[PDB]
Design an enzyme around this catalytic site. Sequence first.
Site, PDB file in Angstrom:
ATOM      1  N   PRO A  87       0.762  -1.081  -0.001  1.00  0.00           N
ATOM      2  CA  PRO A  87      -0.178  -0.100  -0.129  1.00  0.00           C
ATOM      3  C   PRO A  87       0.850   1.225  -0.091  1.00  0.00           C
ATOM      4  O   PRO A  87       0.312   2.415  -0.138  1.00  0.00           O
ATOM      5  CB  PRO A  87      -0.835  -0.079   1.467  1.00  0.00           C
ATOM      6  CG  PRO A  87       0.134  -1.027   2.168  1.00  0.00           C
ATOM      7  CD  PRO A  87       0.690  -2.061   0.996  1.00  0.00           C
ATOM      8  N   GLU A 123       3.406  -7.667   8.494  1.00  0.00           N
ATOM      9  CA  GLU A 123       4.025  -6.076   7.962  1.00  0.00           C
ATOM     10  C   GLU A 123       4.509  -6.028   6.986  1.00  0.00           C
ATOM     11  O   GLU A 123       4.686  -4.772   6.370  1.00  0.00           O
ATOM     12  CB  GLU A 123       4.999  -5.651   9.210  1.00  0.00           C
ATOM     13  CG  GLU A 123       4.257  -5.678  10.580  1.00  0.00           C
ATOM     14  CD  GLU A 123       3.240  -5.020  10.812  1.00  0.00           C
ATOM     15  OE1 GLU A 123       2.047  -5.708  10.894  1.00  0.00           O
ATOM     16  OE2 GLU A 123       3.331  -3.936  10.276  1.00  0.00           O
ATOM     17  N   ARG A 169      -5.446  -8.891 -20.006  1.00  0.00           N
ATOM     18  CA  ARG A 169      -6.473  -8.570 -21.122  1.00  0.00           C
ATOM     19  C   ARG A 169      -5.919  -7.823 -21.974  1.00  0.00           C
ATOM     20  O   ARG A 169      -6.617  -7.335 -23.245  1.00  0.00           O
ATOM     21  CB  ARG A 169      -7.687  -8.040 -20.150  1.00  0.00           C
ATOM     22  CG  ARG A 169      -7.494  -6.442 -19.865  1.00  0.00           C
ATOM     23  CD  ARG A 169      -8.646  -6.060 -19.019  1.00  0.00           C
ATOM     24  NE  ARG A 169      -9.745  -5.463 -19.947  1.00  0.00           N
ATOM     25  CZ  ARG A 169      -9.946  -4.451 -20.625  1.00  0.00           C
ATOM     26  NH1 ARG A 169      -8.869  -3.479 -20.417  1.00  0.00           N
ATOM     27  NH2 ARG A 169     -10.958  -4.096 -21.293  1.00  0.00           N
ATOM     28  N   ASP A 171     -12.968   2.131 -23.367  1.00  0.00           N
ATOM     29  CA  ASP A 171     -13.071   1.738 -22.049  1.00  0.00           C
ATOM     30  C   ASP A 171     -13.035   2.991 -21.019  1.00  0.00           C
ATOM     31  O   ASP A 171     -12.775   4.045 -21.383  1.00  0.00           O
ATOM     32  CB  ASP A 171     -12.055   0.819 -21.442  1.00  0.00           C
ATOM     33  CG  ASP A 171     -12.298  -0.675 -22.050  1.00  0.00           C
ATOM     34  OD1 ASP A 171     -11.466  -1.480 -22.239  1.00  0.00           O
ATOM     35  OD2 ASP A 171     -13.694  -0.966 -22.307  1.00  0.00           O
TER      36      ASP A 171
HETATM   37  N1  LIG Z   1      -3.175  -1.216  -1.272  1.00  0.00           N
HETATM   38  C1  LIG Z   1      -2.515  -2.381  -1.366  1.00  0.00           C
HETATM   39  N2  LIG Z   1      -1.874  -2.797  -2.516  1.00  0.00           N
HETATM   40  C2  LIG Z   1      -1.263  -3.984  -2.624  1.00  0.00           C
HETATM   41  N3  LIG Z   1      -0.867  -4.471  -1.710  1.00  0.00           N
HETATM   42  C3  LIG Z   1      -1.278  -4.413  -0.564  1.00  0.00           C
HETATM   43  C4  LIG Z   1      -2.132  -3.317  -0.228  1.00  0.00           C
HETATM   44  N4  LIG Z   1      -2.617  -3.358   0.993  1.00  0.00           N
HETATM   45  C5  LIG Z   1      -1.866  -4.567   1.594  1.00  0.00           C
HETATM   46  N5  LIG Z   1      -0.974  -5.121   0.788  1.00  0.00           N
HETATM   47  C6  LIG Z   1      -0.388  -6.271   0.842  1.00  0.00           C
HETATM   48  O1  LIG Z   1      -0.860  -7.031   1.972  1.00  0.00           O
HETATM   49  C7  LIG Z   1       0.454  -6.691   2.714  1.00  0.00           C
HETATM   50  C8  LIG Z   1       0.194  -6.993   4.244  1.00  0.00           C
HETATM   51  S1  LIG Z   1      -0.695  -5.307   4.711  1.00  0.00           S
HETATM   52  C9  LIG Z   1       0.862  -4.534   5.329  1.00  0.00           C
HETATM   53  C10 LIG Z   1       0.009  -3.440   5.984  1.00  0.00           C
HETATM   54  C11 LIG Z   1       0.999  -2.166   6.767  1.00  0.00           C
HETATM   55  N6  LIG Z   1       1.470  -2.329   8.014  1.00  0.00           N
HETATM   56  C12 LIG Z   1       0.654  -1.057   6.030  1.00  0.00           C
HETATM   57  O2  LIG Z   1      -0.400  -0.515   6.455  1.00  0.00           O
HETATM   58  O3  LIG Z   1       1.484  -0.417   5.286  1.00  0.00           O
HETATM   59  C13 LIG Z   1       1.361  -6.046   2.072  1.00  0.00           C
HETATM   60  O4  LIG Z   1       2.600  -6.177   2.740  1.00  0.00           O
HETATM   61  C14 LIG Z   1       1.023  -6.194   0.595  1.00  0.00           C
HETATM   62  O5  LIG Z   1       1.571  -7.156   0.057  1.00  0.00           O
HETATM   63  N1  LIG Z   2     -11.525  -0.710 -11.752  1.00  0.00           N
HETATM   64  C1  LIG Z   2     -12.393  -1.300 -11.431  1.00  0.00           C
HETATM   65  N2  LIG Z   2     -13.214  -1.780 -10.368  1.00  0.00           N
HETATM   66  C2  LIG Z   2     -14.138  -2.378  -9.978  1.00  0.00           C
HETATM   67  N3  LIG Z   2     -14.546  -3.171 -10.922  1.00  0.00           N
HETATM   68  C3  LIG Z   2     -14.264  -3.342 -12.170  1.00  0.00           C
HETATM   69  C4  LIG Z   2     -12.773  -2.574 -12.268  1.00  0.00           C
HETATM   70  N4  LIG Z   2     -12.722  -2.634 -13.750  1.00  0.00           N
HETATM   71  C5  LIG Z   2     -13.537  -3.611 -14.343  1.00  0.00           C
HETATM   72  N5  LIG Z   2     -14.434  -4.152 -13.225  1.00  0.00           N
HETATM   73  C6  LIG Z   2     -15.303  -4.959 -13.400  1.00  0.00           C
HETATM   74  O1  LIG Z   2     -15.146  -5.718 -14.540  1.00  0.00           O
HETATM   75  C7  LIG Z   2     -16.315  -5.550 -15.338  1.00  0.00           C
HETATM   76  C8  LIG Z   2     -16.193  -5.782 -16.880  1.00  0.00           C
HETATM   77  S1  LIG Z   2     -15.115  -4.161 -17.511  1.00  0.00           S
HETATM   78  C9  LIG Z   2     -16.114  -3.271 -18.116  1.00  0.00           C
HETATM   79  C10 LIG Z   2     -15.320  -2.348 -18.970  1.00  0.00           C
HETATM   80  C11 LIG Z   2     -16.147  -0.893 -19.389  1.00  0.00           C
HETATM   81  N6  LIG Z   2     -16.321  -1.197 -20.759  1.00  0.00           N
HETATM   82  C12 LIG Z   2     -15.522   0.127 -18.902  1.00  0.00           C
HETATM   83  O2  LIG Z   2     -14.393   0.310 -19.059  1.00  0.00           O
HETATM   84  O3  LIG Z   2     -15.757   0.887 -18.048  1.00  0.00           O
HETATM   85  C13 LIG Z   2     -17.126  -4.286 -14.823  1.00  0.00           C
HETATM   86  O4  LIG Z   2     -18.310  -4.314 -15.163  1.00  0.00           O
HETATM   87  C14 LIG Z   2     -16.617  -4.503 -13.265  1.00  0.00           C
HETATM   88  O5  LIG Z   2     -17.479  -5.406 -12.847  1.00  0.00           O
END
Ligand SMILES: Nc1ncnc2c1ncn2[C@@H]1O[C@H](CSCC[C@H](N)C(=O)O)[C@@H](O)[C@H]1O
Ligand SMILES: Nc1ncnc2c1ncn2[C@@H]1O[C@H](CSCC[C@H](N)C(=O)O)[C@@H](O)[C@H]1O
Lengths: 249, 249
Positions: B93, B120, B162, B175
Amino acid sequence: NAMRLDVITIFPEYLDPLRHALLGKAIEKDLLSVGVHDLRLWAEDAHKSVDDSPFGGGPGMVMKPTVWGPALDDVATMSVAEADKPLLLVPTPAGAPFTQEDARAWSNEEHIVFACGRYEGIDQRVIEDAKKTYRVREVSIGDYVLIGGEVAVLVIAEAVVRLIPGVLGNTQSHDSFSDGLLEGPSYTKPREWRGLEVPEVLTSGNHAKIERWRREQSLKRTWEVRPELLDGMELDRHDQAYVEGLRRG
Amino acid sequence: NAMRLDVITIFPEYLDPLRHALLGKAIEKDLLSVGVHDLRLWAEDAHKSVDDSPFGGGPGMVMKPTVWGPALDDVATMSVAEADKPLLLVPTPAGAPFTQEDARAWSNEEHIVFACGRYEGIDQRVIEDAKKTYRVREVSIGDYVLIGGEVAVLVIAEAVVRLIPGVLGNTQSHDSFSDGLLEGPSYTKPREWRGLEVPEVLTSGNHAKIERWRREQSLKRTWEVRPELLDGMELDRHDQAYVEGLRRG
Ligand SMILES: Nc1ncnc2c1ncn2[C@@H]1O[C@H](CSCC[C@H](N)C(=O)O)[C@@H](O)[C@H]1O
Ligand SMILES: Nc1ncnc2c1ncn2[C@@H]1O[C@H](CSCC[C@H](N)C(=O)O)[C@@H](O)[C@H]1O
């Protein structure tokens, strides 16, 4: 007392991770109940069709109201003033962004239903009609395009369920964004590994200096990666002077 | 010609959806190859330990460099100038946000390795040392806190794969965010459902009016949900006048 999640999808198997790792443990603590439903159960034709060409022409397919409406009607009955309606989450890249505040709010829900889109998405009238039965939220997990809503269910479920007391467990229940900043780096043994030493302050036993180091590293990571987050805060002199030192190199 | 994805995790089963739905089809078209590796294979002690207490005190656990380093070394050999190094994605994060531009860039990679954190996270020296072998990117999928990196792998994989030609197939390969705006609503048969009619323009057969309606609805959805995105654009008079009509109610 258990949160109930119901997911409606044409790929039930995609939701198998709701029963893996920590959410699987949550189920075994009676903190979570999960139902996954094949949308095709509600398709009438012999072909089990769930999608059709869009009005207005153009490519792609749109999921059918005559399948989604009955599915949502039936799932709502699975364990009216607005507050008493269940919550319906509809993943879509055109929805309001998922935030940590949403995760906190939704950790209080007794029943969350997810409608998983594929293709061009779900006919919008499904979402409007669903408001008679549900509190409805369209939600994007980020500014990027996925294939289906199922993976977004897994994302939201992790972020919500981990806020239910008892799920993280004694060791991880104590994060990024909590104070507006990103978390800094973490380290464990050994002290020196592949020529890289853990910051010496962390082995000093001096709690005040360690705590200041942690704050600096959070400011530094935020400055490096999300400097606009610092613009939205009034930093005190200690923090502002530290960040100015980063800008001067 | 197939993109190779390798995922290192303590929950290999979480990645089962990489072989479901469209990514499973991509594998069957020889467009994708997936390897999922249990990090514990690289744990030396009898206990197969992958984590330890953080330096500096404080709660939680940090994943061990003496396990991660060898794992990343070994997986890199699975099918040097920077451009020739494989890409290592580290969900966190505190990483730079995942964007659609990242998805486009990464769709060109031959080999992506993912290091999945839990607890962590991963000792930061792993990430720095990995730069000798990989191009390294720390990546957040959004401003919310997950339990582990595995679900973020599924998110990134969907958005990247995709974009490989042949994966979406003839019907969905055409899109949101493409022009800076969110996509508007979609509709399919029937014309009238539960008292809700599809917008009459969509049944007019007039391509010019339908195309203008689609633009308006994209402006409207963006104004409703992400109005700050409009502030970053210079709208022409047609679009600016339409949005001003929304602001006046
Ligand atoms: N928003 C996010 N995007 C990508 N990975 C995430 C994420 N949130 C949690 N993770 C994943 O989940 C793991 C545990 S959460 C780590 C929490 C940390 N104490 C903090 O808040 O920064 C991370 O190391 C990462 O691999
Ligand atoms: N960023 C995102 N967050 C949450 N759902 C997502 C997403 N991207 C795609 N999806 C999911 O995947 C489905 C197909 S993608 C739909 C694509 C559309 N033509 C556009 O670009 O707006 C969506 O209906 C939703 O359920």
